[PDB]
Design a protein around this ligand. Structure first.
Ligand SMILES: *[C@@H]1O[C@H](CO)[C@@H](O)[C@H](O)[C@H]1NC(C)=O
Ligand SMILES: *[C@@H]1O[C@H](CO)[C@@H](O)[C@H](O)[C@H]1NC(C)=O
Ligand SMILES: *[C@@H]1O[C@H](CO)[C@@H](O)[C@H](O)[C@H]1NC(C)=O
Lengths: 48, 109, 49, 49, 55, 55
């Protein structure tokens, strides 16, 4: 989506400058929310 | 890093790639991407491809079940782009170590 | 916050409901076995009489 | 006879990249399918093969 | 932040319910085994009673 | 100043109205679920009672 947006903006204003690819790292979610995600996975193994 | 669909992060310690390019494509490869084509074409996309693969699988599937297929999926993902963009360079093989899991999950196992 | 705590409370209540149903079925099956035993005991009591 | 071709395709230190870099990956793939008991006790004699 | 904490807390309960179900099922199986034990012990005791009354 | 403080206190009450309404609705839903649990448990118990009376 980000690549599509950038290319759509550029195509007319600055023709000829092509955006081949875009990459992103995984976001840094807050600590409190991250702890719950770990708890969820702890329950998936407590079942085993 | 690899963020599984369960919302937990597992860090794969080492992802190795073994590649090779046919001699006749050397001129074009170095013209297009210089001599750093390895870093430009493989080892910068590795982390994004791994994250994309992990986001659709749970901790169990990546850590245990689909570990037999992590390498094949990553190799196919890399080769799909390389074939179209930089012909000649091929990924002969890929290799991945077992991901590290949080202490709490490791203890339960 | 309340609109989500609502769903959390609903899920916890549903979990309690499932646990109660499992306990009830356990009691039912145990009672079935006990009453089969009672019938056998009564037959033996008839023979003793 | 194949020594010339082997050294041409891969450096003199071929054995590393040809065997001992894949040993750990193959072992992990084998272990992912078998439980601890099978690898430790029962299926142990089949690991070599 | 709390609003987002509740969204994940809903997901934790979805697995905790499975854990609780498994524990309750294990308790049910244990109780059933105990009931069968009692039944068989009673059978033996009552055969003994019949022999007792014959004597 | 207090006259203007009271004017804003009216809005806080307007929002607290919705907050307490949502809390009461959540409690209602929880109570309804508990009642359904009781009903189903009673159904199982009474089927067991019928079987016991047959025996
Ligand atoms: C430069 O700007 C002109 C005037 O808007 C435009 O017509 C032209 O396409 C632009 N070219 C590039 C390469 O940005
Ligand atoms: C080099 O780039 C050109 C133009 O994009 C492309 O047609 C060609 O296949 C590329 N060759 C290699 C070896 O990457
Ligand atoms: C070397 O690579 C060529 C590539 O065509 C292959 O055919 C040949 O068998 C290889 N020889 C070896 C590995 O000794």
């Amino acid at each position: 989506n980000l690549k599509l947006a950038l290319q759509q903006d550029l195509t007319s204003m600055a023709p000829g400058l092509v955006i081949q690819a875009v990459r992103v790292t995984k976001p840094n979610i807050p600590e409190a929310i991250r702890r719950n995600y770990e708890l969820m996975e702890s329950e998936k193994t407590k079942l085993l | 890093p690899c963020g599984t669909s369960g919302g937990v992060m597992i860090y794969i310690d080492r992802i190795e790639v073994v590649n090779m390019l046919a001699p006749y494509a050397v001129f074009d490869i170095v013209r297009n991407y210089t001599a750093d084509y390895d870093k430009t074409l493989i080892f910068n996309k590795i982390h994004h491809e791994l994250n994309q693969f992990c986001s659709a699988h749970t901790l169990q599937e990546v850590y245990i079940e689909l570990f037999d297929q992590i390498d094949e999926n990553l190799k196919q993902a890399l080769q799909k782009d390389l074939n179209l963009m930089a012909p000649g360079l091929t990924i002969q093989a890929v290799r991945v170590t077992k991901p590290k899991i949080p202490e709490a999950i490791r203890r339960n196992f | 916050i309340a609109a989500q705590k609502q769903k959390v409370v609903e899920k916890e209540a549903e979990t309690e409901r499932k646990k109660a149903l499992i306990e009830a079925e356990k009691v039912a099956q145990v009672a079935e076995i006990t009453y089969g035993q009672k019938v056998m005991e009564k037959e033996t009591e008839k023979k003793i009489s | 006879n194949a020594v010339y071709d082997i050294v041409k395709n891969y450096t003199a230190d071929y054995d590393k990249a040809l065997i001992f870099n894949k040993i750990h990956h193959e072992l992990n793939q084998f272990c992912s399918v078998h439980t601890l008991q099978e690898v430790y006790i029962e299926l142990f004699d089949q690991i070599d093969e | 932040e709390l609003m987002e904490a509740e969204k994940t807390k809903l997901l934790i309960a979805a697995q905790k319910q499975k854990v609780v179900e498994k524990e309750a099922e294990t308790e049910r199986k244990k109780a059933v085994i105990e009931a069968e034990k009692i039944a068989q012990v009673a059978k033996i005791r009552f055969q003994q009673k019949v022999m007792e009354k014959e004597t």
